[PDB]
């Protein structure tokens, strides 16, 4: 899994993630 | 899985993700 | 799976994702 | 799992994460 | 798990994390 | 688990962490 | 002008606004 | 102009604003 | 102009603002 | 201009502001 | 201009401000 | 300009400020 994030003025969630089991947002 | 994100003024969710099991947003 | 996102003024969900099992939004 | 984040003016959550079990945000 | 963060003017949570069990934000 | 953080003007939480059990923020 | 917003999991722009002159998004 | 915002898990721009002249997002 | 914000887990820009002239985000 | 902010777990920019002239974020 | 901020666990920029001229974040 | 800040566990910038001319963060 390749993750690269290059933001400038984000203002908000860059929710770059990965998971097997359960979650919640 | 290749993930690259290059935002400028996001203002919001860039929900770049990956998963096998269950989730919830 | 090739994922590239180059946004400018997103304002909203760029839900770039991938998965085998179940999910929910 | 490859994670690199290069922000400039974030203003917000860069929630770069990874997990097996449950969570909550 | 590879985590590198190179911010400039963060202003906010760079919540770069990883976990098996439960959490809460 | 490899963690390196090289900030310049943080202004905020660089909550670089790791854990098995429960937490709270 | 009455504006009330009660969100739960927004993920995006709640652009509740008001204006006379010009704008741009 | 009445503005009240009661969010729970925002994740994003609650851009509650007001203006006469020009702007840009 | 009445502005009240009562957030719980913001994660992002609550850009509650007001202005006559120009701006930029 | 009435501004009151009562946050609990902000994690991010509560950019409560006001201005006549130009700005930049 | 009335500004009151009553935070609990901020974690981030409460950029409560006001200005006529130019700025930069 | 009325500024009162009553924090509990700040963890971060409470950048309560005011200015005419230019700045930089």
From Swiss-Prot, chains A, B, C, D, E, F, G, H, I, J, K, L:
The modification Tyrosine amide is found at residue 25. Transmembrane segments: none annotated. It is found in: Secreted. Amyloid fibrils are degraded by insulin-degrading enzyme IDE. Can form homodimers. Interacts with IDE and INS. Interaction with INS inhibits homodimerization and fibril formation. IAPP is the peptide subunit of amyloid found in pancreatic islets of type 2 diabetic patients and in insulinomas. Amylin/IAPP is a glucoregulatory peptide hormone that plays an important role in the regulation of energy homeostasis. Selectively inhibits insulin-stimulated glucose utilization and glycogen deposition in muscle, while not affecting adipocyte glucose metabolism. IAPP function is mediated by the CALCR-RAMPs (AMYRs) receptor complexes. Amylin can also bind CALCR receptor in the absence of RAMPs, although it is more selective for AMYRs. The mature protein is largely unstructured in the absence of a cognate ligand, and has a strong tendency to form fibrillar aggregates. Homodimerization may be the first step of amyloid formation. Belongs to the calcitonin family. This is Islet amyloid polypeptide. The lineage of its organism: Eukaryota, Metazoa, Chordata, Craniata, Vertebrata.
